[PDB]
Amino acid sequence: MGRILFLTTFMSKGNKVVRYLESLHHEVVICQEKVHAQSANLQEIDWIVSYAYGYILDKEIVSRFRGRIINLHPSLLPWNKGRDPVFWSVWDETPKGVTIHLIDEHVDTGDILVQEEIAFADEDTLLDCYNKANQAIEELFIREWENIVHGRIAPYRQTAGGTLHFKADRDFYKNLNMTTVRELLALKRLCAEPKRGEKPIDKTFHQLFEQQVEMTPDHVAVVDRGQSLTYKQLNERANQLAHHLRGKGVKPDDQVAIMLDKSLDMIVSILAVMKAGGAYVPIDPDYPGERIAYMLADSSAAILLTNALHEEKANGACDIIDVHDPDSYSENTNNLPHVNRPDDLVYVMYTSGSTGLAKGVMIEHHNLVNFCEWYRPYFGVTPADKALVYSSFSFDGSALDIFTHLLAGAALHIVPSERKYDLDALNDYCNQEGITISYLPTGAAEQFMQMDNQSFRVVITGGDVLKKIERNGTYKLYNGYGPTECTIMVTMFEVDKPYANIPIGKPIDRTRILILDEALALQPIGVAGELFIVGEGLGRGYLNRPELTAEKFIVHPQTGERMYRTGDRARFLPDGNIEFLGRLDNLVKIRGYRIEPGEIEPFLMNHPLIELTTVLAKEQADGRKYLVGYYVAPEEIPHGELREWLGNDLPDYMIPTYFVHMKAFPLTANGKVDRRALPDVQADVAPTDELEQQLAQVWSHVLGIPQMGIDDHFLERGGDSIKVMQLIHQLKNIGLSLRYDQLFTHPTIRQLKRLLTEQKQVSLEPLRELDEQAEYETSAVEKRMYIIQQQDVESIAYNVVYTINFPLTVDTEQIRVALEQLVLRHEGLRSTYHMRGDEIVKRIVPRAELSFVRQTGEEESVQSLLAEQIKPFDLAKAPLLRAGVIETADKKVLWFDSHHILLDGLSKSILARELQALLGQQVLSPVEKTYKSFARWQNEWFASDEYEQQIAYWKTLLQGELPAVQLPTKKRPPQLTFDGAIQMYRVNPEITRKLKATAAKHDLTLYMLMLTIVSIWLSKMNSDSNQVILGTVTDGRQHPDTRELLGMFVNTLPLLLSIDHEESFLHNLQQVKAKLLPALQNQYVPFDKILEAARVKREGNRHPLFDVMFMMQGAPETELESNMHHINAGISKFDLTLEVLERENGLNIVFEYNTHLFDEGMILRMVAQFEHLLLQAVHGLDQQVKRFELVTEDEKRDLFLRVNDTAKAYPNKLIMSMLEDWAAATPDKTALVFREQRVTYRELNERVNQLAHTLREKGVQPDDLVMLMAERSVEMMVAIFAVLKAGGAYLPIDPHSPAERIAYIFADSGAKLVLAQSPFVEKASMAEVVLDLNSASSYAADTSNPPLVNQPGDLVYVMYTSGSTGKPKGVMIEHGALLNVLHGMQDEYPLLQDDAFLLKTTYIFDISVAEIFGWVPGRGKLVILEPEAEKNPKAIWQAVVGAGITHINFVPSMLIPFVEYLEGRTEANRLRYILACGEAMPDELVPKVYEVLPEVKLENIYGPTEATIYASRYSLAKGSQESPVPIGKPLPNYRMYIINRHGQLQPIGVPGELCIAGASLARGYLNNPALTEEKFTPHPLEKGERIYRTGDLARYREDGNIEYLGRMDHQVKIRGYRIELDEIRSKLIQEETIQDAVVVARNDQNGQAYLCAYLLSEQEWTVGQLRELLRRELPEYMIPAHFVLLKQFPLTANGKLDRKALPEAAPRTELEATLAHIWGEVLGIERIGIRDNFFELGGDSIKGLQIASRLQRINWTMVINHLFLYPTIEQIAPFVTSEQVVIEAAAEN
């Protein structure tokens, strides 16, 4: 109780805590303005709560509210204080969290009441992190509010520390909100300034030159042809000339012009000017007279040093000092007094005079010094190295060549002018002199790479874009980048492998590169932007141009460092390198696409016959820009070959319309490719018919191509789905009618001529503007939307919300006026929907008030503020659109939300186009047509002939069995859920251009290609299904006069495609196209009509026809539409939606998945598999579809590490050896227990040897088959051990089996002797030397141990199969296979000496083998259970208590009785594990088993006979309950693979065929090579050994365990849903009159399978009651149709449920009759029962609301959700009479 003043940012901030306060009877006064000391906001206030408040309270307000002001700060105090806590916490890597504290006189330092921490994931963005922090702090304020008003929380002071930030501190980071934490940290690390350690150099260039000369005086400095000089002579000459220059008057920062050629005197004069104190200005004598005059006039140089040949080029403007005059050189060879400084100029160079006038770049000494100090240790320039002065001295190229080598002791070499251009002579000179390391420009290096050089060791290139690295030398290639204004180069990269775009490299020492947008803000890693250079590389600026210097060399307003603009578009790579993308002024619009020509260069140079490529943009008289490609080649390549080569990876608008063959590109003085000295030439089946000329003109007006040809494919000339429609529109301006599909079947002008010369079919019927009526009709789409909206009244699943971001200079009132004008313009924004009877009617309102909202939020507060505004709409009120403007701290978010019935895609485009037109002050013409006319026309068209022909296609296609796709989902909810999330996948522009080019070349679109990829992906996830089905969204614009109207026109189409894996990818593309063309031909059919024409019922937890949606959007029309972002409020309309968008020349694929079906890991793995499939199909066009795989290598390794890979070495000693050892060790220990016989180890060994010696004597070799048909007794074990010691394998035969099976086994195997008991000798018919087991004969007197002749590869026992097919075969198992399983079970389950083992199962199965040979290793005792106590549970339970058994192997069919006959009576002991193999263990028996015996462990085991008894184990914990009871990971030395029909690994969730491999695999089938080869097939996953195909269908889990589904030979396809018969078994225990049951899928005559639930009961139950009991929870496609009565299910030998031995109303009251009559009038059935299901008699969503309309016609409001819950008239009756209230009034006078 109290009155709380809630101060915050805006009105709706933190609605959770406000509602929590209002629920606790507390009044909340929301305010956002500044609170005055004496106002109405402070009078009568008990508490004050602040949540990101934008103001500061006064001192008196805090004084009058001590301990009453509670502040909420989403940060871990004292860290991150002020503004933007989460952002600076993620950036500065501080411990994050949330805090709820008090407010003192100081800000953000009060006593902390509550303080908690929070963790931020790496994949979460800053916005998601801020949302999570706000949610956590709101939950904390909700949870700890009753602890503050009650004084429970004890305030504590804060700690001294933390950080502090302000408001503008984030101005440098306004474009980093949509980035993740990992990307933000990477950007922080790769852009952090280095530590204060790089000390600057306080020395110039001449000082370092003198220091180097003093070290290596006699070393040769510069060489010129035949003459060379040393460092000493060069230094002396430079000193003399500098003395002579200083005698004239050379002062610091003064300019001295130099016009000399490449020789010694040039470098001499350069060094002299450097030592004298001035800066040398190089002027190339080869320059034209105009450029030389300009460089002489602009430069303030009064002294010129030139020869007598180039003297007249000076025109006598400066003091000429000839460098050949002896009087022009002094005599003092000593060095000049150093009077220079590092900030003084060293050289002044001019740029190119192309773009404007030449600019005098001023470079200081420290710039060059740093460049040389970086260039020397980086490449290791030794004094023995040689360089070349290749580039002219008027560029930085010569500087790097001269100074770089000159500052390390190298020897420069002057390249001859006769051998400069001729690269052959240059290579010869380099091989002669031994040049190691020098710089060459881009073109020169790319042309020199063809030369065979053997002396080069380091060749550096730069200036232009490097695209060729293939060379003929052993030297390293280095790419350099750097403008003239930033001292030669700034970044260097070492080329080591081919790249599609060669990066420029990392910056040098004391140099940094920034990627900034147009607003001087930082850009994330991977985003293009303008390049900025900072550091020591920057010079002084431009000569005599201070304005341009300040315009270029700028000062950042945020940081303050002096940066330089390079005007180049670059991008930051994640590895630290920088990728050059081109210039910012080269971006040209080529046929509606702003692209860069440079990107076309690496795709044209890939041709083997082309060396150099230059793509440029030229302008024609029409004003359009076209592309021209100049290529260097020895021979001219035709235009068609180049077009075909470029159309493989690039789209049509990226192919140059002209190609020019050149011998060599003209290079300038610096070596760059002259883009202005290129030659431009023009050129040299043409139509003839008037109609052909008209079609060519129309294609020219649409596609924007000046010349169109006849055989020119529309898709090969830049045509998408949009323009085609426009094309049709243009045709409808001439009178020709063309459909959407026909253009895809007639792509050439010849086929268009063939089509337009047959029939007319031109229905020139205008939309026919309707008159002013009171009520207008509605379309079927609007009818469907109204039906869906009235189903869930407060639903926002069909609310379309768009957001735009405008700058702070845009007025909100203007936006409001534009939106009001748009509402008053279109009638759709002024329409209401009503229900007059059973019809949905539309009413027009002439005026509607727009609900415009204006709020003041923040950048990080947008998602929650928009979600708070997403509220359901009322279709009976106008308008149906809400608009709001949220003013953040740097931009304004304009959001608008409408209903899907009024706004779709093209309507959104039109709205964006009109909004941009209104915001630009433009007059729009009134609309001509309305939605009402289209509705009338479409309602009247439903009775025409075209509608019948279009609906006949859907009636014929959707009449048979439809393929039911199955996605790897979790447990589907019982109802239709809509909660979902969205992931994003990015296809880079390269693969996008590749896909588009492939589609255009093979006569396809990108839409059809993506559709085929999605279909192949769904097929692969559906175990390579032949047919798939999925929904798509088209245009729906049926009438031509509807391309400029507002309203929902889109229609959904259920495409049913066929995928043939045996064919190639191109064949599947063609099949998908041929299946999509007729579907798009009949696209104008309502989805409700398609559902009704399917003749298929619909009532479940799945969609009607499809669960996968596929949508695609190309390029937007206007720029405002590109700025519109669609906001999703966590609503998934289907199970999985794939929305492709063509954005930023790349593809954005939105995966809209459901949360109850997919989490985050599964959807990420699915996106990865889709990416892998796309990458496989983009390169494997001719490859087969079955060769493609989904599961990537990472997921395979993860599954192999989590499931398989269990190599554990086990001893190879046979069981016979261990038995002999433990018998000779402990002879007096009990080994066998049989009623009163307690045979030890010694007596057993002797009795076994007495028979083994006789078997060896009567001829028994290894690998022989000895039959044994003895029952459970000591003699059986003795005979088994004797046969094992003899060498042969024992074959168990059931004595109670008929003679036919025994004779068949004897005929199939071929044994040599049969061992049997005394009553079982006659049954063997006395075959071939039979021996009695009970007789005293056939027992030798020798009791010694026979030699261990057997090997681990011999057969241990033979196990015939159960004979499910009819012909059983014996399985051959080796000793190693059994021994490995035994050792694995002993390691997982220790059977020590005090422990025991029971022999329960019959010896005619592999399960009994583990009991027989399990007590061997562990010195245990086996209790041979009597055969009479096999089915008696009491005797087994008593023997377990008596003998004290620890390990027991049970059957999932005998465990139920074994537990029911106990019910927890007496207590047992020593019992540990309970092994259960054979069938699937249920889940409703584990808790009962643990309640009966809470001192045992449950182990679900699985393994066929051919896999050596068991193969997989799973320990069911006592505290864990698993719904699907899995089989667990494989045992040690086991490998279980879930493969598919094509030999491909299945992912998580997708069911596949299980196979087992390992060293414990059986040999094969006895005397059956065909079946062995069929069941044991070699798999490519295991290069050696072999893998057994179990023939079962199972699936994995999230952890790695396998869930046994069922046998592959038994498919479950009931009607159209694939649900196993395991969920029906859950209602068995819930019932009382039925004991045990079973459900078996049966077949009839027509093939339609029908269920038949066999159950056991005391009496026969009514079929109607049995169906009513199952109808409560299970639907109709799961209830069996037949029910029979059985006393007890027949069991087999093992004790399992034999699946092959089984025998083959009226209404009362008034409301009931009313609902029955209503259903009879709507559904169309005469007699309506009181318990009949709504969906049972053809009840669709359409008729579901027809019932509600009929009810409302009788004044009854019924919700469709209530009908979905109560479909029975017996569950709808108690909800109708509750809407009648009799109210009367008084009347008396």
- The full DSSP string for 1687-1740 is SSPPB-SS--B-SSSS------SHHHHHHHHHHHHHT--SS--TT--TTTTT--
Task: Identify the H or E element spanning 266.
Answer: helix 264-276
- The full DSSP string for 319-360 is EE--TT-GGGS-S--SPPP----TTSEEEEEE--SSSSS--E
Three-class SS of residue 212?
helix
Fold observed for domain 943-1116+1125-1190:
Chloramphenicol Acetyltransferase (3.30.559)
Token pair listed for 685: 């089946």
Three-class SS of residue 447?
helix
Residue 893 identity: V
Spatial distance between the Cα atoms of 636 and 380, rounded to a whole number of angstroms? 44
Contact 1215, 1416 (CB under 8 A): yes
Residue 1712: φ, ψ to 5°? -60, -45
Spatial distance between the Cα atoms of 1435 and 248, rounded to a whole number of angstroms? 127
Token pair listed for 419: 């051998």
Q: How many contiguous H segments (helices) and E segments (strands) does the chain have?
A: 49, 67
- The full DSSP string for 1480-1528 is ---SSSHHHHHHH-TT-EEEEEE--STTTS--EEEEE-SS---SS----
Spatial distance between the Cα atoms of 485 and 503, rounded to a whole number of angstroms? 21
Token pair listed for 696: 């060519």
Burial (0-12, 13-18, 19+ Cβ within 10 Å), 1021: buried
The CATH code for residues 796-927 is 3.30.559.10
Q: What is the dihedral of CA 180, 184, 187, 190, to 10 degrees?
A: -120
Query: CA geometry: angle at 1343 spanning 1339 and 1348, to 5°?
Result: 105
Q: How far is CA 445 from the centre of its chain?
A: 42
Contact 947, 1075 (CB under 8 A): no
DSSP assigned state of 1184:
B
Specify the CATH class of 1710-1775 in words. mainly alpha
Number of other CB atoms surrounding residue 492 within 10 Å: 21
Token pair listed for 32: 């956002």
Token pair listed for 190: 């790769």
Three-class SS of residue 1261?
coil
Contact 1413, 1388 (CB under 8 A): no
Q: How far is CA 1104 from the centre of its chain?
A: 28
Spatial distance between the Cα atoms of 1530 and 1502, rounded to a whole number of angstroms? 9
- Method for this entry: X-ray
Burial (0-12, 13-18, 19+ Cβ within 10 Å), 1300: exposed
Residue 1639 vs residues 393, 1631, 1670, 1688: alpha-carbon distances, Å: 94, 16, 13, 15
Residue 1135 vs residues 219, 1031, 1032, 1094, 1153: alpha-carbon distances, Å: 79, 11, 14, 21, 6
Spatial distance between the Cα atoms of 1390 and 119, rounded to a whole number of angstroms? 43
Residue 1318: φ, ψ to 5°? -60, -45
Residue 773 identity: Q
Contact 1403, 1694 (CB under 8 A): no
Residue 540 identity: R
Name beta bridge partners: 1655: 1637, 1685
Spatial distance between the Cα atoms of 1689 and 1698, rounded to a whole number of angstroms? 7
Contact 441, 400 (CB under 8 A): no
Residue indicated by tokens 């390794």: 1197
Spatial distance between the Cα atoms of 478 and 492, rounded to a whole number of angstroms? 7
Output 288-295 pairs: Cβ under 8 A, ≥24 positions apart. Answer: 289/313, 291/353, 291/358, 292/259, 294/353, 294/358, 295/257, 295/350, 295/358
Residue 605 identity: M
Spatial distance between the Cα atoms of 850 and 820, rounded to a whole number of angstroms? 7
Spatial distance between the Cα atoms of 1687 and 1395, rounded to a whole number of angstroms? 40
Phi-psi region for residue 1118, left (φ > 0), alpha (ψ -120 to 50) or beta?
beta
Name beta bridge partners: 1555: 1537, 1589
DSSP assigned state of 854:
E
Spatial distance between the Cα atoms of 308 and 292, rounded to a whole number of angstroms? 16
Token pair listed for 1113: 């959007």
Three-class SS of residue 841?
strand
Contact 1510, 1381 (CB under 8 A): yes
Spatial distance between the Cα atoms of 1748 and 788, rounded to a whole number of angstroms? 13
Three-class SS of residue 1338?
coil
Burial (0-12, 13-18, 19+ Cβ within 10 Å), 315: exposed
The CATH code for residues 1610-1704 is 3.30.300.30
Spatial distance between the Cα atoms of 170 and 168, rounded to a whole number of angstroms? 5
Contact 755, 692 (CB under 8 A): no
Spatial distance between the Cα atoms of 857 and 168, rounded to a whole number of angstroms? 16
Residue 563: φ, ψ to 5°? -110, 160
Superfamily of domain 595-662: ANL, C-terminal domain (3.30.300.30)
220-224 and 227-230 as β-strands: parallel, antiparallel, unpaired? antiparallel
Spatial distance between the Cα atoms of 1068 and 1062, rounded to a whole number of angstroms? 10
Residue 1653 identity: A
Which residues lie closer than 8 Å to 1366 by C-beta, 6 or more apart? none
Spatial distance between the Cα atoms of 24 and 150, rounded to a whole number of angstroms? 13
Contact 1514, 1527 (CB under 8 A): yes
Contact 1243, 1290 (CB under 8 A): no
The answer to whether the peptide bond before residue 597 is cis (omega within 30 degrees of 0) is no
Task: Identify the H or E element spanning 368.
Answer: helix 365-379
- Whether 690-755 and 1213-1351 share one fold: the answer is no
Contact 73, 141 (CB under 8 A): no
Spatial distance between the Cα atoms of 320 and 840, rounded to a whole number of angstroms? 98
The CATH code for residues 690-755 is 1.10.1200.10
> Which among 229, 236, 235, 287 has a CA at the least distance from the CA of 257?
287
In what order do the strands lie in the sheet containing 345-350? 319-320, 303-306, 255-259, 279-282, 345-350, 360-364, 541-542
Spatial distance between the Cα atoms of 78 and 96, rounded to a whole number of angstroms? 11
Q: Is the dihedral of CA 1418, 1421, 1427, 1428 positive or negative?
A: negative
Q: Is the dihedral of CA 1365, 1369, 1375, 1376 positive or negative?
A: negative
Spatial distance between the Cα atoms of 1388 and 1390, rounded to a whole number of angstroms? 6
Residue indicated by tokens 């309502």: 1086
Q: What is the 3-class SS of 615-670, one letter each residue? A: EEEEECCCCCEEEEEEEECCCCCCHHHHHHHHCCCCCHHHCCCEEEEECCCCECCC
Contact 459, 445 (CB under 8 A): yes
> Which among 1335, 1338, 1234, 1316 has a CA at the least distance from the CA of 1270?
1316
The CATH code for residues 1213-1351 is 3.40.50.980
Structural domain boundaries in the chain: 2-189, 595-662, 690-755, 796-927, 943-1116+1125-1190, 1213-1351, 1610-1704, 1710-1775
> Which among 1254, 1279, 1265, 1417 has a CA at the least distance from the CA of 1346?
1254
End-to-end CA distance of the chain: 50
DSSP assigned state of 416:
P
- The full DSSP string for 779-838 is -HHHHHHHHHHHHSTT--TTEEEEEEEE-TTS-HHHHHHHHHHHHHH-SGGGEEEEEETT
Number of other CB atoms surrounding residue 156 within 10 Å: 11
277, HSE (Cβ side, Cα atoms, 13 Å): 17
1422, HSE (Cβ side, Cα atoms, 13 Å): 24
Please, what's the largest Cα pairwise distance for the chain? Answer: 141
Three-class SS of residue 893?
strand
Spatial distance between the Cα atoms of 1558 and 1506, rounded to a whole number of angstroms? 12
Token pair listed for 1304: 């068949």
613-619 and 1634-1642 as β-strands: parallel, antiparallel, unpaired? unpaired
The answer to whether the peptide bond before residue 337 is cis (omega within 30 degrees of 0) is no
DSSP assigned state of 673:
B
Number of other CB atoms surrounding residue 768 within 10 Å: 13
> Which among 603, 610, 692, 698 has a CA at the least distance from the CA of 651?
603
Residue indicated by tokens 């509220």: 871
> Which among 351, 352, 348 has a CA at the least distance from the CA of 362?
348
Superfamily of domain 2-189: Formyl transferase, N-terminal domain (3.40.50.170)
Contact 565, 585 (CB under 8 A): no
Contact 520, 548 (CB under 8 A): no
Spatial distance between the Cα atoms of 1291 and 1304, rounded to a whole number of angstroms? 14
Which residues lie closer than 8 Å to 823 by C-beta, 6 or more apart? 829, 830, 848, 850, 879, 881
> Which among 1011, 1027, 1049 has a CA at the least distance from the CA of 958?
1027
Token pair listed for 1076: 């999509």
Residue indicated by tokens 């874009």: 465
Token pair listed for 1308: 């199939």
Name beta bridge partners: 1642: 1650
Spatial distance between the Cα atoms of 992 and 1112, rounded to a whole number of angstroms? 14
DSSP assigned state of 1083:
-
Token pair listed for 459: 């060749």
Spatial distance between the Cα atoms of 1056 and 1090, rounded to a whole number of angstroms? 13
Which residues lie closer than 8 Å to 460 by C-beta, 6 or more apart? 400, 437, 438, 439, 440, 478, 479, 480, 492
DSSP assigned state of 474:
S
Contact 120, 85 (CB under 8 A): no
